[PDB]
Design a protein around this nucleic acid. Structure first.
Ligand code: ZN
Ligand code: ZN
Lengths: 122, 121
RNA sequence: GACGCUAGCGUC
RNA sequence: GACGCUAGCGUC
């Protein structure tokens, strides 16, 4: 399905983002656009920051719900931007039209409309 | 479908053929024939366990001394002491072409899976 | 053996 | 984050 879909925290089922705001960096990593998502996660300086490829691993990000704090991914410095990078294993994908939920472990198995990251959008 | 060879993934020594492979409970895989018994050695299992219709009695390893790659287990099934192998320990070679394939789980290997028959040899 | 989990470890 | 490896752990 290329239809729009929701991402919920796999632990607490809180809404995180929608597939329409997802951008793909280097056909491998996934980020979310908009400020509404920044409220849904909290970050902490990474216990072991690293530089790889085109990223600066600076922080870990977690579900903002203090009762949850589920690991969602990392926060990196990419080019001139500081953006979050998420892993799908921390989320449940819900089809908006039908409500069907899907548990992915790797992004290669989630087939949705993947918009390439565009710097001009930010 | 076509017959294929299984080589030890570490030392590439031939172990068996898909014709001699039988399936137990559509989940476990054993090898028929006496040629295969020359290809593995056994060692009593560190954590013996009974599960389903199996008594986990030993681990099995490649008989080549410079290899001894872990190949699976050896179990007591019904009235038989038979080996049970895991595909991750082997590389599958096609007979006609020599194309090699590395499988990690049996569910991804598609061939004519003949069910184990206690009457069959 | 099938499968599940955790934990580190390494790579760009 | 993506991938790889290891090591145990749990289930029949
Ligand atoms: Zn949550
Ligand atoms: Zn060997």
């Amino acid at each position: 399905d290329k239809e729009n879909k929701k991402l919920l925290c796999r632990k607490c089922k809180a809404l995180a983002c929608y597939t329409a705001d997802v951008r793909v960096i280097e056909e491998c990593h996934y980020t979310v656009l908009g400020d509404a998502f920044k409220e849904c996660f909290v970050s902490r300086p990474h216990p072991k920051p690293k530089q790889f490829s085109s990223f600066e691993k600076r922080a870990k990000i977690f579900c903002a719900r203090q009762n949850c704090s589920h690991d969602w991914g990392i926060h990196v410095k990419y080019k001139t931007f500081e953006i979050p990078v998420i892993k799908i294993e921390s989320f449940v994908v819900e089809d908006i039209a039908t409500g069907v939920q899907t548990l992915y472990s790797k992004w290669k198995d989630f087939h949705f409309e993947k918009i390439p990251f565009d710097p001009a959008e930010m």
